[PDB]
Design a protein around this ligand. Structure first.
Ligand SMILES: [Zn+2]
Ligand SMILES: [Zn+2]
Ligand SMILES: [Zn+2]
Ligand SMILES: [Zn+2]
Length: 111
DNA sequence: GTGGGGAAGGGGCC
DNA sequence: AGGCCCCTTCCCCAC
């Protein structure tokens, strides 16, 4: 629980305070050594490394399929079970992704 | 108008 | 203080 000196908002996490400040300046200290592409966060560079190496460690437990990223694994999991998990309370329309439900909720015409 | 890919942040655990 | 992973919303796209 720390307060950002710039936008005066509470940021939780001891080490996350420098990272949030990095979003107010646009600096990208981390740079890939192969494609020379600069990133704002280190973990994003780690994902970019997964692209170059070709590693797909996200292995489905039910069927054994391997995927590059986590969201690709999530998209495969809904095929195994729960194709359309979300729903609108008022209109009872099924949705696949949370943002898609918020898309209907952004209109908010049912409420 | 619907699905999805990727981006951009915030947080939890170690 | 930071790596590594998860989650979310949002832009923008082919269909
Ligand atoms: Zn700030
Ligand atoms: Zn690269
Ligand atoms: Zn599977
Ligand atoms: Zn609705």
């Amino acid at each position: 629980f720390q307060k950002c000196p710039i936008c005066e908002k509470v940021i939780q996490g001891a080490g996350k305070l420098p990272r949030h400040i990095r979003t107010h300046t646009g600096e990208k200290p981390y740079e890939c050594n192969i494609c020379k592409v600069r990133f704002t966060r280190q973990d994003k560079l780690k994902v970019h490394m997964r692209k170059h190496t070709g590693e797909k460690p996200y292995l489905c437990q039910q069927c054994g399929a391997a995927f590059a990223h986590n969201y690709d694994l999530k998209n495969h999991m809904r095929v195994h079970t729960g194709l359309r998990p979300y729903q609108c309370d008022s209109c009872c329309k099924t949705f696949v992704r949370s943002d898609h439900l918020h898309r209907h909720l952004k209109k908010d015409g049912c409420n």
